[PDB]
Ligand binder design. Sequence first.
Ligand SMILES: CCCCCCCCCCCCCCCC(=O)O
Ligand SMILES: CCCCCCCCCCCCCCCC(=O)O
Ligand SMILES: CCCCCCCCCCCCCCCC(=O)O
Ligand SMILES: CCCCCCCCCCCCCCCC(=O)O
Ligand SMILES: *C(=O)CCCCCCCCCCCCCCC
Lengths: 38, 49
Amino acid sequence: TSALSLSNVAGVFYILVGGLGLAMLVALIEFCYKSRAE
Amino acid sequence: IDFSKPFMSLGISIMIKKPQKSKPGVFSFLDPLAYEIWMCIVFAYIGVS
Ligand SMILES: CCCCCCCCCCCCCCCC(=O)O
Ligand SMILES: CCCCCCCCCCCCCCCC(=O)O
Ligand SMILES: CCCCCCCCCCCCCCCC(=O)O
Ligand SMILES: CCCCCCCCCCCCCCCC(=O)O
Ligand SMILES: *C(=O)CCCCCCCCCCCCCCC
């Protein structure tokens, strides 16, 4: 038994960073919408 | 020749290098995960925050 490597949990890291990018996109879209409005 | 009764019974045995007690390291609670994972968790923590 060896210690778990980054290759074992690499996918969750990708999902996390993808979620962090999606949230930034979502947030800026609302900001872009509100800015146009007024 | 005529030997006497054996004064020391013996035979063929197995000799191996005596192992070590493998005293656990101080920071051995980190062993279940690799150094890269621990380092990446800190990076992920900073990024998420
Ligand atoms: C719930 C918010 C979104 C979470 C997931 C966002 C997508 C992030 C990227 C997913 C992994 C992309 C790489 C695929 C790897 C492969 O199959 O070769
Ligand atoms: C939605 C805004 C952009 C977010 C971009 C986040 C991308 C995360 C996933 C990148 C995967 C790149 C490495 C793939 C590894 C593999 O296929 O094995
Ligand atoms: C990975 C690529 C990152 C790109 C980052 C660029 C972000 C651009 C948005 C910043 C604010 C723009 C405000 C525009 C307002 C408007 O005219 O509606
Ligand atoms: C909340 C996210 C991270 C904070 C708590 C996680 C603890 C991280 C400590 C790991 C230290 C870096 C790796 C040590 C080196 C090694 O394991 O050999
Ligand atoms: C309004 O809609 C203007 C901004 C639109 C684009 C916003 C781009 C930034 C958000 C995505 C961040 C991606 C992070 C990962 C990069 C590899």
